Nucleic acid binder design. Sequence first.
RNA 1: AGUGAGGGCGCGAGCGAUAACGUCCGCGUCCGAGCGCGGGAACAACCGAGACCGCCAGCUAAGGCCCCCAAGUCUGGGCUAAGUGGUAAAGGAUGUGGCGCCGCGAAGACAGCCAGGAGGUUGGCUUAGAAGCAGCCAUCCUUUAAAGAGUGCGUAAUAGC
RNA 2: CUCGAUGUCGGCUCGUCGCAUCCUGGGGCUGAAGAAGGUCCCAAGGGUUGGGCUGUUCGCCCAUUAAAGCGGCACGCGAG
RNA 3: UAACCGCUGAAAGCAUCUAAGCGGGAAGCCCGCCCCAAGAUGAGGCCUCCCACGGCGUCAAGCCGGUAAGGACCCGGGAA
Lengths: 174, 37, 122, 206
Amino acid sequence: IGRLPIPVPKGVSVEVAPGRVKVKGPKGELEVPVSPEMRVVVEEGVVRVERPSDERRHKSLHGLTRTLIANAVKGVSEGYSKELLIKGIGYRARLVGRALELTVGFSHPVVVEPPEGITFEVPEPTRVRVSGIDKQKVGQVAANIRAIRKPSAYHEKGIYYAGEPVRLKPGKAG
Amino acid sequence: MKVRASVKRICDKCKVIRRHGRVYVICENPKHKQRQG
Amino acid sequence: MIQPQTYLEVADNTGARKIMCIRVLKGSNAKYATVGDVIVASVKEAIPRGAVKEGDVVKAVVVRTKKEVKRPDGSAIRFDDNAAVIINNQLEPRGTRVFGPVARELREKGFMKIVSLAPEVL
Amino acid sequence: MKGILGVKVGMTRIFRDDRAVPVTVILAGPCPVVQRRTPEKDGYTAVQLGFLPQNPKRVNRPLKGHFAKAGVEPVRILREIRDFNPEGDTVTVEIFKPGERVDVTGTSKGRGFAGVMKRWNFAGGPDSHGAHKIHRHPGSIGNRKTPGRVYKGKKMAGHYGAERVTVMNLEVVDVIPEENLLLVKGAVPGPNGGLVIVRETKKAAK
RNA sequence: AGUGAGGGCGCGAGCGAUAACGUCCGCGUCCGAGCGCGGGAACAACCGAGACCGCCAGCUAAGGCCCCCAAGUCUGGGCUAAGUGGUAAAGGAUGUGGCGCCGCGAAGACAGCCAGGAGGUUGGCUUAGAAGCAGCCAUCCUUUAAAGAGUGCGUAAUAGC
RNA sequence: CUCGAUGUCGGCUCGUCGCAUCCUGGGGCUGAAGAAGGUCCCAAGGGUUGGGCUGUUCGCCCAUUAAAGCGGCACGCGAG
RNA sequence: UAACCGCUGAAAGCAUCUAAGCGGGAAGCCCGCCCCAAGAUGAGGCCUCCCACGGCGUCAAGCCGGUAAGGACCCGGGAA
């Protein structure tokens, strides 16, 4: 009824191999997990995740294999770029090539490196983020960077995802 | 915040989070860090 | 060379060139009112007038007798034991005082005044 | 990074604009007496000797163990792993460059047999209000039903001199390439005019 | 002729704090004084059981059968999965599984979605502002996406979600 | 159990484990600006001074100190 | 890895760090640091070297020389 419907457009390399499902698209040969009982098909344009039951384990498993391998696909279709925005009077940014310029620790050496699907985008640099491929590892690295200085609820000067409304509290007494 | 006990949520929409037998309430207000595991 | 409890000599605005220190002002584990150091004490000896009194200051380490061994293998020993009394900051006590030169002191540095102050023979 | 030696004696010297004290290291130059090829002793390494005490005196075995890659006529020998032999004979006439940091050790001069007194710190007990043991003696050793008995590994009286050991970092100070000698300002680890060795390890980030 | 003082366990009253391998009395068993065997790890009194002496005999208690060690790593149907097994209460909880029950307007559901979030809604005080999103209650009307006497981020009302 | 025998205090000397950790760090929280406090969960690693008076350990007081913890072992220690 | 922070994600067709799978992280845990150590009968591993030593009832795992192959003994010396 509902927790298993998805199409596999682009004629993507949509195949199941040694107990691992191989989703190959712009290159992201993404390895989407395959629980032995979940099971799925990709015929015509329709890709379906099945349920060898419906109890707790399985049902969640469904939500998963479905959503996550769904990922495998959408991903293999484009290229996974994380939109991110650096912003704060205290900070600098430029690709440098394969790292993380960055400067707001007032002893700025910030020489980072790009894991993989990770390409650096400095078009601002106020607006500035990265592109990845692997939705999981991408949101992640993004995070790594955010984390390393970003916080600031009461005074801003950080890195922000899309940049949530950053809830902020007063300083002294007024 | 934590307490080997109590926790009846709070922040009017304070979340009952299941994590590691960890009775941990998650919210949108630090005031509610409810760690009772 | 050192001591905890001590009958030491001074010669600043002293009540008497003598006070008894408790211990060393250094790294919590005294045991050595040592050459060129800074420590604690009260008076032992008398004091005609003088705004000094029978109180207690802290201050800095002069002479010793049991090896003033310096960086340059400069070497010495005076058959005398005494330091200069301090007022807070360190800023020495008296206008002058009876004694003289030699590395260790100035070297510790913080007290140049003592430095130029006790120069000549004695 | 290793030197094999006959430790001489400790003495004082001067450096820059100040004196300070060193020690006399002396080593003719050990040589590839035995090699653990790895396929040989996958604990790969070099064993060498560095002098020569009388030949008329020498077990056949020794004679041929030498035979091996054949070298000379001594008796001072020992081994160390993870150290290539970019040679087949070593001296130190450069082997050990000065103005460098080193680590080193040797035999440990042989003490005696003194209790709570020696062996360990804290000089014995006290003396006066009690003299039925005057000044020092053995601390305490356990108790009633705690473990219900006598303990098993706290310091103890006696023999504590016939052993060996080493010192962490020390300075290479100076190199005398002729008389294969080097001054190093060292804890003269163990006697002198006897046996020692040096090795260098310290990825120490200050 | 011997004990003329004894303890334990279960139930029933004392007492004690409804504490103690406490001490008081009673019904029973007990254990000594047989209570020497099984046994529960090993443990005087907790379930089994009375040993006159044999058996390189077989049926059984209790309680056991992957192994250490005799005995199915039986079959059958479940429910937990924390290692509970492998001591604990008060009490806490979108634990796990189970009821015996509630919402299904396929006049096609809920979390996810889209857009509008309607005009009198405009003081009552306070109006510096209520003109739902400042305090003492208001509980009506038209009007359609069906209607918020406006559950909520708020300041100067207000304006926006 | 112990009265055919179990040395009770205070201290000494050598201590050994323990965490409801004092200093240490790791932390979320603040009525958290900084700094600094204070509010809990994690973690014993090392560390966890001198004197004064008092036979008193506790204690009060002098001077510092990063700090100068509570306590288990017949309140460890007489075959020391 | 502790608390504590996150990524990807369902079962709770919006959400969640959370079984699934991934990461951050403590002066603490294994290592790295030195010091013991196959009497770790589960080593000995490598090097050199005397010979497979010589006589005795086969089962010769007993005798004697065998080798100074080597070492012990006594002597003489040692911060051992």
